[PDB]
Design an enzyme around this catalytic site. Structure first.
Site, PDB file in Angstrom:
ATOM      1  N   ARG A  60       0.878  -0.924   0.048  1.00 21.31           N
ATOM      2  CA  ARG A  60      -0.133   0.086   0.099  1.00 21.31           C
ATOM      3  C   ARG A  60       0.946   1.114   0.080  1.00 21.31           C
ATOM      4  O   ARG A  60       1.932   1.322   0.682  1.00 21.31           O
ATOM      5  CB  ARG A  60      -1.088   0.115   1.367  1.00 21.31           C
ATOM      6  CG  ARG A  60      -1.754  -0.873   1.536  1.00 21.31           C
ATOM      7  CD  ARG A  60      -2.753  -1.452   0.434  1.00 21.31           C
ATOM      8  NE  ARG A  60      -3.509  -0.221   0.142  1.00 21.31           N
ATOM      9  CZ  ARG A  60      -4.228   0.002  -1.160  1.00 21.31           C
ATOM     10  NH1 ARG A  60      -4.175  -0.950  -2.003  1.00 21.31           N
ATOM     11  NH2 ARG A  60      -4.795   1.139  -1.431  1.00 21.31           N
ATOM     12  N   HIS A  97      -6.045  -2.991 -10.611  1.00 19.90           N
ATOM     13  CA  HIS A  97      -4.936  -3.450 -11.324  1.00 19.90           C
ATOM     14  C   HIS A  97      -5.570  -4.421 -12.286  1.00 19.90           C
ATOM     15  O   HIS A  97      -5.954  -5.599 -12.196  1.00 19.90           O
ATOM     16  CB  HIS A  97      -3.898  -4.067 -10.419  1.00 19.90           C
ATOM     17  CG  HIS A  97      -2.889  -2.955  -9.986  1.00 19.90           C
ATOM     18  ND1 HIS A  97      -3.250  -2.305  -8.770  1.00 19.90           N
ATOM     19  CD2 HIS A  97      -1.851  -2.201 -10.431  1.00 19.90           C
ATOM     20  CE1 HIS A  97      -2.362  -1.396  -8.485  1.00 19.90           C
ATOM     21  NE2 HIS A  97      -1.365  -1.480  -9.602  1.00 19.90           N
ATOM     22  N   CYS A 104       2.702  -1.772  -9.730  1.00 23.84           N
ATOM     23  CA  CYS A 104       2.352  -1.042 -10.844  1.00 23.84           C
ATOM     24  C   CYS A 104       1.868   0.386 -10.639  1.00 23.84           C
ATOM     25  O   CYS A 104       0.589   0.083  -9.901  1.00 23.84           O
ATOM     26  CB  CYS A 104       1.770  -1.831 -11.859  1.00 23.84           C
ATOM     27  SG  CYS A 104       1.589  -1.104 -13.437  1.00 23.84           S
ATOM     28  N   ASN A 118     -13.507  -5.414  -9.368  1.00 23.67           N
ATOM     29  CA  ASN A 118     -12.168  -5.502  -8.958  1.00 23.67           C
ATOM     30  C   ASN A 118     -11.591  -7.037  -8.744  1.00 23.67           C
ATOM     31  O   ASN A 118     -11.090  -7.539  -9.315  1.00 23.67           O
ATOM     32  CB  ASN A 118     -11.763  -4.447  -7.869  1.00 23.67           C
ATOM     33  CG  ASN A 118     -10.361  -4.486  -7.649  1.00 23.67           C
ATOM     34  OD1 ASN A 118      -9.540  -5.590  -7.882  1.00 23.67           O
ATOM     35  ND2 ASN A 118      -9.887  -3.404  -7.212  1.00 23.67           N
TER      36      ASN A 118
END
Ligand SMILES: [Mg+2]
Ligand SMILES: [Mg+2]
Ligand SMILES: [Zn+2]
Ligand SMILES: [Zn+2]
Ligand SMILES: [Zn+2]
Ligand SMILES: [Zn+2]
EC number: 3.1.-.-
Lengths: 162, 162
Positions: A60, A97, A104, A118
């Site tokens: 995080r 992501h 990333c 997600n």
DNA sequence: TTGACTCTCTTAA
DNA sequence: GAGAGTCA
DNA sequence: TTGACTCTCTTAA
DNA sequence: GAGAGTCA
């Protein structure tokens, strides 16, 4: 911060900094027996991470800027979407992501969607294996496959029907 | 420790009791535009639930039996799998609803698998829509579909490539 | 021995 | 997948 | 003002 | 998706 100009400035500062992160090539399953290549812009493993960035958990990070002499801080992957609605159908929007690579920060690998959407990408067959996501997946989900179920449905007596 | 015979007796008493839960007919998507029928054996909404059953959370119950003066208690959906391995590939096994109906205690609607396998069934296209689960799904997952993504991948400048 | 409540915990996005 | 506080 | 740490929280299986 | 405590 409050103004659209200030928000565009935050996004632009973030893109400039993230754009200098190491570009790591990852070869990924697409589904349908095909393979593709993604270019992830990966935040460093340890400090310093880049101007405005700090690590708040194992995977995080947060981006912070001083605007109007006040500190404004956001989850590292939320910045591209600061001008988007923060909810959908009463569910919180999350950075998601498409490359399934937390480090990333490539905004071309991110979308903005409910936590359910997600999560569900983890099991998607992928853009060449039958992905039906309206915002298409970039790869087959890492958990796609037959699974490893230990025991299936069963009964000892005759009390149940399917 | 409980013997195999004692565990079988727990499973049998559990089945006897669950077999008297109201049996509710549900029409469900199977994938591929097909509809099927599942028959769920639904624990009551409020007490009394049935012999041995008690509610520990909004959608959590436990089954309890006292054997030779010792109180034994199990998650209410785990009882069919008491003679199975409790872990696989280093991951804990969970009760997993193929009907996606927590109140249901029909053991023909349950399997025993990792939490990741369990969750992933939420997005499965279903037994007539391309399910690849080795222990096949009974229905299309409730969250299958194009999703409701608010914003897709995007950049303001030219710092990134996919 | 049993029912009906109470509390907190796990995982990985 | 998140927000926020403590220091230097 | 900026950096580098610390902590707990949310969700729905 | 879980485990365990209290009280009568
Ligand atoms: Mg994700
Ligand atoms: Mg499930
Ligand atoms: Zn990436
Ligand atoms: Zn997809
Ligand atoms: Zn059922
Ligand atoms: Zn399936």
């Amino acid at each position: 911060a409050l103004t659209n100009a200030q928000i565009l400035a935050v996004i632009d500062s973030w893109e400039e900094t993230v754009g200098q992160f190491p570009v790591i090539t990852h070869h990924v399953p697409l589904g349908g027996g095909l393979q593709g290549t993604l270019h992830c812009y990966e935040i460093p493993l340890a400090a310093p991470y880049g101007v405005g960035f700090a690590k708040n958990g194992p995977t995080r990070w947060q981006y912070k800027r001083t605007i109007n002499q006040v500190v404004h801080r956001w989850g590292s992957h939320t910045v591209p979407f600061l001008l988007e609605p923060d909810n959908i159908n009463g569910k919180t929007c999350t950075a998601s992501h498409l490359c399934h690579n937390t480090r990333c920060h490539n905004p071309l690998h991110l979308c903005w969607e409910s936590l359910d959407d997600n999560k569900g990408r983890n099991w998607c067959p992928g853009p060449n294996g039958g992905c039906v996501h309206a915002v298409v997946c970039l790869r087959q989900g890492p958990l796609y496959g037959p699974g490893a179920t230990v025991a299936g449905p069963q009964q000892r007596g005759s009390h149940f029907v399917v």
